[PDB]
Design an enzyme around this catalytic site. Structure first.
Site, PDB file in Angstrom:
ATOM      1  N   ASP A  35       0.824  -1.199   0.000  1.00 49.39           N
ATOM      2  CA  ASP A  35       0.000   0.000   0.000  1.00 49.39           C
ATOM      3  C   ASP A  35       0.866   1.260   0.000  1.00 49.39           C
ATOM      4  O   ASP A  35       1.355   1.673   1.052  1.00 49.39           O
ATOM      5  CB  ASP A  35      -0.894  -0.013   1.245  1.00 49.39           C
ATOM      6  N   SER A 199      -0.391  15.616 -12.120  1.00 47.82           N
ATOM      7  CA  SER A 199      -0.627  15.234 -13.505  1.00 47.82           C
ATOM      8  C   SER A 199      -0.848  16.486 -14.335  1.00 47.82           C
ATOM      9  O   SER A 199      -1.369  17.490 -13.846  1.00 47.82           O
ATOM     10  CB  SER A 199      -1.840  14.308 -13.588  1.00 47.82           C
TER      11      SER A 199
END
Length: 330
Positions: A35, A199
């Site tokens: 994770d 992004s």
């Protein structure tokens, strides 16, 4: 040193991925959920409330000659999906794919919430976010990666998740045969303890690319892709009959649909998520309403590049002095 381990979807929907991990002496092998959105290595154990164990493999520290109680230490964690676990702490030898850390904090669960109990395939979590998020008190502990880093050939790990198929976690090296083209690296902020990056934009299907900054986290422990409501609405508007359902808890679409791809930007590069990756199947057994793999982050407070996004790429988690993230197509 290096390590290399195969990671395998837990079910036909890629709801999560499990990777075998060796703990203790002699080895006890548990299947852990790696994770990158948390920083605790915790396991189902011989100390876990019996009624909260249902099919998981447990760690039994009393059978490990290298286990030592970390005296006074406790831990307690809550995740974004509302699940939680807590307990006490041992140190022991932990190996992943041939890479060994001695003295790793292994957090033994005394209590786990229902969603953990109900998932027989996940024996615990191995956190790979930054150690500043580790919940052990009163002495915060380091992640497996943080402990291994100095010994690694290169201070990196990579995630190569499969679509409806196994993939690989590598530690200490970049497998240049595992991706196409070049790796594009992008800046990371560690201020919130996550692999947080920006992004450069998105496209829906064959549509034009929209240049826009989208801050979010690379999180292997989240199933879906969570993005701003504007972006998500633009995606689902291209699917006939798709709608946001308050009762279901997100966007649903007709199971008869063919979904468009979704592209996200990494610098000047582009990662394309095929439409099929965005299909999470019937909302309930036999339903013709299907659950979407791209959902709104509104009210999460952060955008999350979860497995739906990450499995479309070869992803480098670069833990150099200034950390960065790399993405390649594959």
């Amino acid at each position: 040193s290096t390590g290399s381990a195969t990671t395998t979807p837990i079910d036909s929907l890629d709801d999560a991925y499990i990777t075998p991990v060796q703990i203790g002496t002699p080895a006890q092998t548990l299947n852990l959920d790696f994770d990158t959105g948390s920083s605790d290595l915790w396991v189902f154990s011989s100390e876990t409330t019996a009624s909260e164990v249902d099919g998981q493999t447990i760690y039994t520290p009393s059978k490990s000659t290298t286990a030592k109680l970390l005296s006074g230490a406790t831990w307690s964690i809550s995740y974004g999906d509302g699940s939680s676990s807590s307990g006490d702490v041992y140190t022991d030898t932990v190996s992943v794919g041939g890479l060994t850390v001695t003295g790793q904090a292994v957090e033994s669960a005394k209590k786990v919430s229902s969603s953990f109990t109900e998932d027989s395939t996940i024996d615990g979590l191995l956190g790979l976010a930054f150690s500043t998020l580790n919940t052990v008190s009163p002495t915060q502990q380091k992640t497996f990666f943080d402990n291994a880093k100095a010994s690694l050939d290169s201070p990196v790990f990579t995630a190569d998740l499969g679509y409806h198929a196994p993939g690989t976690y590598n530690f200490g090296f970049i497998d240049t045969t595992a991706y196409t083209g070049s790796i594009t690296y992008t800046a990371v902020s560690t201020k919130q303890g996550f692999w947080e990056w920006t992004s450069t934009g998105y496209a829906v299907g064959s549509g034009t690319f929209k240049s826009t900054s989208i801050d979010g986290i690379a999180d292997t422990g989240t199933t879906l892709l969570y993005l701003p409501a504007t972006v998500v609405s633009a995606y689902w508007a291209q699917v006939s009959g798709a709608k946001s359902s308050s009762s279901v808890g997100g966007y649903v679409f007709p199971c008869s649909a063919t979904l468009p791809s979704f592209t996200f930007g990494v610098g000047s590069a582009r990662i394309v998520i095929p439409g099929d990756y965005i299909d999470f199947g019937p909302i309930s057994t036999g339903s013709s309403s299907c659950f979407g793999g791209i959902q709104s982050s509104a009210g999460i407070g952060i955008n999350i590049f979860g497995d739906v996004a990450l499995k479309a790429a070869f992803v480098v988690f670069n833990g150099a002095t200034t950390p960065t993230l790399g993405f390649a197509s594959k």
